Write a protein that binds this ligand. Sequence first.
Ligand code: 5OK
Ligand code: K
Ligand code: K
Ligand code: ZN
Length: 355
Amino acid sequence: PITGLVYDQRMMLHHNMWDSHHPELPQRISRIFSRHEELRLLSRCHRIPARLATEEELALCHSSKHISIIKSSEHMKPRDLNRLGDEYNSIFISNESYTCALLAAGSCFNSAQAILTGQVRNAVAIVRPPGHHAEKDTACGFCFFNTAALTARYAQSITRESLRVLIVDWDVHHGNGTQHIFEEDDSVLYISLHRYEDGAFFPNSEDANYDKVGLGKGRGYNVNIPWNGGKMGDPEYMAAFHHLVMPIAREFAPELVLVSAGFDAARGDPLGGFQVTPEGYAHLTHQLMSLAAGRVLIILEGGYNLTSISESMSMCTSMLLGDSPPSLLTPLKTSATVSINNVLRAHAPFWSSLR
Ligand SMILES: O=C(/C=C/C#Cc1cccc(NS(=O)(=O)c2ccccc2)c1)NO
Ligand SMILES: [K+]
Ligand SMILES: [K+]
Ligand SMILES: [Zn+2]
């Protein structure tokens, strides 16, 4: 039918009390929402309500210890908040943090439900804190709970356990948590494009490399597309979709598509250093829309240039609403060609469409 949108101002309450210029800013989501309104995209959408995730829903991917620890931060005074934050890789916590993480997850569940119950065809979730770095047992890189991973499981819980869910993660950073959660799982195809730099780029693990293809029955169902050697843009991203993402995805025949949609590969992003354009993101989205009968949920992850993320995510919602793709390239950077050839060599034994 239509396009769903979920957004809740309360998720702005998560904040960094010791550094109010930390790039994971509250107004990330409010700038995005504002922009959807200015471009008249908001009123074309069906407003999906936000909700808290339950602790039972969190246990779909996370350990009870981790849930309890993060939940306990709710009552901590600043000294202990800071102490708990420092126990993870790149985490700040405020008393509202846990609530905001629950809201982000819950928001996505409701959206996935609207899709799967046929209330909407596709949807956007303007949410924070992000999630794809979060592991089963720990918080990481601004992420408390793995929103995307939880949503895949939630979708499976209201349809069937083996429901084919594709997760495309085009945030500039590798989704270590998402990869790990489904690494042995053939029901969830994880595809991530990320800056790698041989382990120099956050989160600095060889897990992000192209030769990590999955374990056990999940072998082949984890696809890393690692970038090395500086700036990449629309041509590199269109190529990777063309040669890898779409052919593998079609072959997987997903019943639902989740996008971990960080916009930190955007032109202008201070952490990403890439130059994917709003138009670029629109085309990526428009391609994914051809999958799973159009059942596509776009979930905000990273992205720290307020204008860039506002422009890029708006363009994605434009495509979900069915607007025509904007016009678009250039020869690939040589290392991007190597990256793609590497992935192709690594996944050709698992996907006939690559042969
Ligand atoms: O988007 C993401 C996460 C991005 C990140 C990061 C990171 C990790 C370690 C060090 C720094 N240094 S900093 O300048 O970006 C900085 C960061 C935060 C506060 C102050 C300075 C950044 N995942 O999808
Ligand atoms: K990624
Ligand atoms: K997998
Ligand atoms: Zn990121």
